[PDB]
């Protein structure tokens, strides 16, 4: 019986998660253990660099967060949360945290390097994915949300920008600052405009169903090449989202449109993933009839697309940035705020 096997698997996974949540790892490397290779990304309070571990030669992505900037932009809780989640979860489609540490100036999260880069750039380059291609990625997100929701985590950050494609063509989910434990409801206005469920926009108390809405947005964008609700300004996007109207490209299959009508459902009593049968309403939908869910989880399905890779440290799938210093102050900054990191 697969159902009993899934229940046992998820109960074991929850025990392991809670153990690691209660006793997080800390201070498992230091900066001079690494050589910097290239800046892979920049943000308002941090950067991501390709680094090489001097002792082993292994490549990693090092997320470097400026503590003072985190404090300025009110991201203390999100940043502490991301690291605590990353060191506690364990699932094939979630990025792996290898080391973490801090110094006078910065917080550091060292993760396995995924040279294939973001789904976003591959999607924009190719234009759109065929439905079998979109379905392959969609299935991995379904299973990832089944795992996260079983831990009572709402993800709240789904978009192609936050999905990496690894060397076997499978997805790695990257970001967890917004992942909150919610057994009941929560209220924060957060996410990315195109991916916000209507109940978030309408300032309602909301739950894990917002992730299944976001899955609908992701599937639509992957298959069409553009998201279902867009406009010049976020407020105009929000008006479209809450309207309950959506149009589909003529090349969308009937099965795809039916799935999307049930995921992009403004009424929570009708949205797939939020009904009595839960995720099984999605897994058993006709669009997924050819999906071997166990084989996806085991990464035994041949990926439809493998990114170009010329070595463990190739950076060709990432943008080019001006290389700036990593300055570490002589004075400790914000020590109390980040004591638990």
């Amino acid at each position: 019986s697969e159902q009993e096997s899934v229940k046992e698997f998820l109960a074991k996974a929850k025990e392991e998660f809670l153990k690691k949540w209660e006793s997080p790892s800390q201070n498992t490397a230091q900066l001079d253990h690494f050589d910097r290779i290239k800046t892979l990304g920049t943000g308002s309070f941090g950067r991501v660099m390709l680094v090489k571990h001097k002792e082993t030669g292994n490549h990693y992505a090092m997320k470097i967060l400026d503590k003072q900037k985190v404090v300025k932009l009110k991201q203390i809780e999100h940043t502490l949360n991301e690291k605590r989640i990353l060191q506690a979860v364990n699932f094939p489609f979630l990025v792996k945290l290898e080391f973490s540490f801090k110094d006078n100036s910065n917080l550091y999260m060292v993760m396995e390097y995924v040279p294939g880069g973001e789904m976003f750039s591959h999607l924009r380059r190719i234009g759109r994915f065929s439905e079998p291609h979109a379905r392959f990625y969609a299935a991995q997100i379904v299973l990832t949300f089944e795992y996260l929701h079983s831990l009572d985590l709402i993800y709240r950050d789904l978009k192609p920008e936050n999905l990496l494609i690894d060397q076997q063509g499978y997805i790695q989910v990257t970001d967890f600052g917004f992942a909150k434990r919610v057994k009941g409801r929560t209220w924060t206005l957060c996410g990315t405009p195109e991916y916000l469920a209507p109940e978030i926009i309408l300032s309602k108390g909301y739950n894990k169903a917002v992730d299944w809405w976001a899955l609908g947005v992701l599937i639509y964008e992957m298959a069409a090449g553009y998201p279902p609700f867009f406009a010049d300004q976020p407020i105009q996007i929000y008006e479209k989202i809450v309207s309950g109207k959506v149009r589909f490209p003529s090349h969308f299959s009937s099965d795809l449109k039916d799935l999307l009508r049930n995921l992009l459902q403004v009424d929570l009593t009708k949205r797939f993933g939020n009904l009595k049968n839960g995720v099984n309403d999605i897994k058993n939908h006709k669009w997924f009839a050819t999906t071997d869910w166990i084989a996806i989880y085991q990464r035994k399905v041949e990926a439809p697309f493998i990114p170009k890779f010329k070595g463990p440290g190739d950076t060709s799938n990432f943008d080019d940035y001006e290389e700036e210093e990593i300055r570490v102050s002589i004075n400790e900054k914000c020590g109390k705020e980040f004591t638990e990191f």
């Binding site: 950050d157 978009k159 920008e161 957060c190 990315t192 195109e194 553009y226 998201p227 010049d232 976020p234």
Partner: peptide, 18 residues
């Protein structure tokens, strides 16, 4: 086309969280 309208929206690059 709808694609053209998407390009006209200007939100074709990486999107920030609110």
């Amino acid at each position: 086309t709808t694609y053209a309208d998407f390009i006209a929206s200007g939100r074709t690059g990486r999107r920030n969280a609110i």
